[PDB]
Design a protein around this ligand. Sequence first.
Ligand SMILES: Cc1cc2nc3c(=O)[nH]c(=O)nc-3n(C[C@H](O)[C@H](O)[C@H](O)COP(=O)(O)OP(=O)(O)OC[C@H]3O[C@@H](n4cnc5c(N)ncnc54)[C@H](O)[C@@H]3O)c2cc1C
Ligand SMILES: Cc1cc2nc3c(=O)[nH]c(=O)nc-3n(C[C@H](O)[C@H](O)[C@H](O)COP(=O)(O)OP(=O)(O)OC[C@H]3O[C@@H](n4cnc5c(N)ncnc54)[C@H](O)[C@@H]3O)c2cc1C
Lengths: 523, 521
Amino acid sequence: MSGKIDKILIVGGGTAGWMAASYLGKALQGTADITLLQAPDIPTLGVGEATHPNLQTAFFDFLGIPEDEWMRECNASYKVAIKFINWRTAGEGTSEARELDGGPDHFYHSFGLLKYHEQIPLSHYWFDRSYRGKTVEPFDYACYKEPVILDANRSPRRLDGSKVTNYAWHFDAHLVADFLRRFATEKLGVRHVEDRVEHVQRDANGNIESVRTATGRVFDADLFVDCSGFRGLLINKAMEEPFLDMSDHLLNDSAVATQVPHDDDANGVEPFTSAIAMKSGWTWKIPMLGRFGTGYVYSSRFATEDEAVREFCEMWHLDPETQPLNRIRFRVGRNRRAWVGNCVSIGTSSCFVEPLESTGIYFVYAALYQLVKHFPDKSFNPVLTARFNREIETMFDDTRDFIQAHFYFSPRTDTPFWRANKELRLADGMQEKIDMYRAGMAINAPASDDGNFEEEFRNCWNNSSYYCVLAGLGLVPDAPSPRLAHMPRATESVDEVFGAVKDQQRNLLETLPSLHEFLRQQH
Amino acid sequence: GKIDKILIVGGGTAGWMAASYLGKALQGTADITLLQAPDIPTLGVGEATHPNLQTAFFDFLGIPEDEWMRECNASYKVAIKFINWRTAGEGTSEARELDGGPDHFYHSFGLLKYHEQIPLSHYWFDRSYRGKTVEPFDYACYKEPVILDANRSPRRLDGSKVTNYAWHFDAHLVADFLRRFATEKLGVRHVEDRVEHVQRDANGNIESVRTATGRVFDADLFVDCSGFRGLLINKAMEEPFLDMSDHLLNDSAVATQVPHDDDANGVEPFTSAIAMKSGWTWKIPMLGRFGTGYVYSSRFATEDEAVREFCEMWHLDPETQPLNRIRFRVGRNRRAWVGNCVSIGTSSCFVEPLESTGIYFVYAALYQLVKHFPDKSFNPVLTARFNREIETMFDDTRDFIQAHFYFSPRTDTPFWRANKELRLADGMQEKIDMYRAGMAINAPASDDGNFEEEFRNCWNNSSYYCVLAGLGLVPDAPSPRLAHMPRATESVDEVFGAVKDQQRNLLETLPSLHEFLRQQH
Ligand SMILES: Cc1cc2nc3c(=O)[nH]c(=O)nc-3n(C[C@H](O)[C@H](O)[C@H](O)COP(=O)(O)OP(=O)(O)OC[C@H]3O[C@@H](n4cnc5c(N)ncnc54)[C@H](O)[C@@H]3O)c2cc1C
Ligand SMILES: Cc1cc2nc3c(=O)[nH]c(=O)nc-3n(C[C@H](O)[C@H](O)[C@H](O)COP(=O)(O)OP(=O)(O)OC[C@H]3O[C@@H](n4cnc5c(N)ncnc54)[C@H](O)[C@@H]3O)c2cc1C
């Protein structure tokens, strides 16, 4: 008809559903009735989530929830980077970095800012000097202060609370889902109903009229938010929207994961996510308090579940026959359209990719940001739906492209998995970015090098991220940027810029507490 | 190796902007020569500009605003004032009456305030749609219209800047200024000669240019600044020019310079775009004079009809007024940069100056050329990535300008009716759909100098509202979000009130632009 949305039904009560309830509860507050339907499900182990800095500025801040309120309640730790281990060297799946050229085979994709120098990113000066043999230092150690302090498990804040670098969070998603469920029901008036969808009623325009639950209750709404996970009960099963499998870009479709106890008093806490290259995939390590989550993401085309269970358990010296394990088969890809008619998918009902760059929770609140930006009324103007679906489809495919490049540009050829990855095609948009990168250009350079989710959303994979991963793996431009041969003042003074980085490395290495000591003081 | 030698063909405004920008960007690492032939000079009919002329061009050169402004007799521009685009009638310089008021509206450089993450325009239309206001969009949401109605200065007499502004000037004077700067301070070689023959090698790149006196010039990079002739890019390199008169009917102009008593009438701090029967007429106020030109469509008026309509409006004698008559090419090259040849200026692209883009296109392109600067291998990714930046820069402006005519309510002449039968480009038609659905179009990331941000967000939500709501195209209904933000819609009363205060305080304390202009001399 027309008028404002009066009633919203969220189907699904995991992390996405309760993020959707809390974000919509706050954004529309007092002007819509929100109900969430969640059925009891077999519980899983807390295998860990790694996040991005704008989890605080785009989500919890929007809720009005200060970082310390949700941190203490969710037993969270700090993330300063992803550390990529053994992506360039042949061998078994092990937690120890092999040796490369006199050093450990690792590199960092950190959250630090890449400094500009005369309107040109430090990455271009680094490669100019490396190409001409004036340096042999790796890109991440040359252009960021973080690698040196992450090697020493430093805290990102000083013990007086001073923040010295940008950081994200490690936590158990189950605890955040519980925190938000309490927040949404107790403070935003979201109705929780424990029930299982049995039938979805569609009208002759193809919109959802009502959902009937197994107890016979009927829920009607103006807007239906599908947060039912991989099953996609609304968007795929009721609305019949196709899912785009994207196995021609991403071979990984499975995981085996668990949680491992950890003596933080004996070993400290690593302030980073580890992505550890394996024979047929890669393994995440997400440090938490007293434990770490870990999971082997692998490709069913190259390893059986038993082979993956054994490789994963042997690597951590666990018993394959008795270790409590989550065995998962992922749905990799996205719906053809995220929002159809009066049904909006949020979470893995919408899209999923392996967590190689910690996008799972980002995709939820980014989409929720896009839903409110494009919020309809009961007439459901099709431009709003089309302009949202465009944003979701670009957010995902860009991430898909970026992640594929982690495997496509690895030098490894030792197993059928790493060799097969080089036989897939990059998407046209990705290949153009590579052409630019090889031609010495920045890729999606940030407008500034200095909170604003719209800028972050469009430049989420920027020039710093592409250099960190591509140069980390050893793909570097064909030759230096031609604009540097005409800027001898710039290339002569940039020595001071790298020197400022080394000073920060040595000063922060000398004065920062261990992440363990700071975590200990925060309790 | 790196580029050693650059030859610029063409010494108008574009050529000398190219010489100064490249001379500055490459200084000490390339030899630049500019080839310019003696040509019949034209009247200075005036140029209107954008605020980043200072931050993207003169600041890059190291030339402070007061140095070039005073030496080029420039005046200040705060907005374009659109006159009589909603009312039938002859070409007259005075706003007809619409609905209890004059038929004008402003597209200003001011920033649209945000309110709880949402542009003030959305609240304005919500209240106007719900009948809680009848104020036009520009007077409700900007401080500028009130002080522009009173020809106020954008800076106080102590220099305090009160609003964003750009410049009106005679381009020939800025071109002279830049020729002196490039030759005297950047070492650019000036040669007065006429190109007679261009030699191409077997890959189709330019080898050398031979002049009428028999001199031969070679280079690594050739910059075509030869205007509508495209001697390098179109004639020598054979790159097709894409005519785009299926979006823009205007292809001609008759223009002049008219003396003006500033002591009796002050100086208008805005460009006027005055609707005509078969086009529109610009007015660019300068010191003691204004440039003016009737931009019209040859398919709807003869040159004589246009000369008469233009001369009568300004009470000029067609038989004794000095008039420039021009027929331009509307559109752009298929590619701006081909092989070792880069077009800058009207050799590259041209559109009527309805939104003062002419000089912008030059330094925007020069920025992109340096950003994509090649070496002698001419990496094709660099050329393709430059060509793509130029073609969206142009096509976007083309679409925005077409919408000034397409959404005019007028139906009184074949010209205004014909504009409504053209097609909008698919991208513009999507932008219109968003606008009707209550969305912002290309909202500024912030509401607070950075050309990369300015370049991609050049036609943003304020500009679309100023023009579309100016002409009377408004969304189908208020933004659905506002019905869910009752705190925001109740506190926005204050936001409008702050604008009204700023309006009344500046109207009473600002000097006339004339008074500020006189203090600057
Ligand atoms: C096993 C797994 C591990 C992951 N690990 C990581 C990681 O380590 N790092 C990272 O960045 N991202 C990770 N992700 C991705 C990301 O974290 C999640 O996709 C994101 O949190 C959204 O998940 P979800 O709640 O939408 O899906 P789910 O957690 O599967 O939600 C399922 C919910 O749907 C509801 N539901 C289902 N059927 C019904 C029904 N008939 N009736 C009523 N309710 C129903 C239920 O309430 C149920 O709780 C992982 C995803 C999965 C599936
Ligand atoms: C009539 C006209 C009016 C305009 N009005 C406005 C306005 O009101 N507002 C706005 O914003 N923009 C306006 N513009 C656009 C803007 O002014 C232009 O971008 C810029 O001012 C002129 O670009 P140009 O130097 O490349 O063209 P031109 O000045 O025409 O370039 C011609 C140069 O090329 C040289 N040359 C040509 N052929 C040869 C040859 N064989 N050998 C040697 N030298 C050669 C000539 O010697 C000459 O120096 C207008 C443009 C034109 C043409």
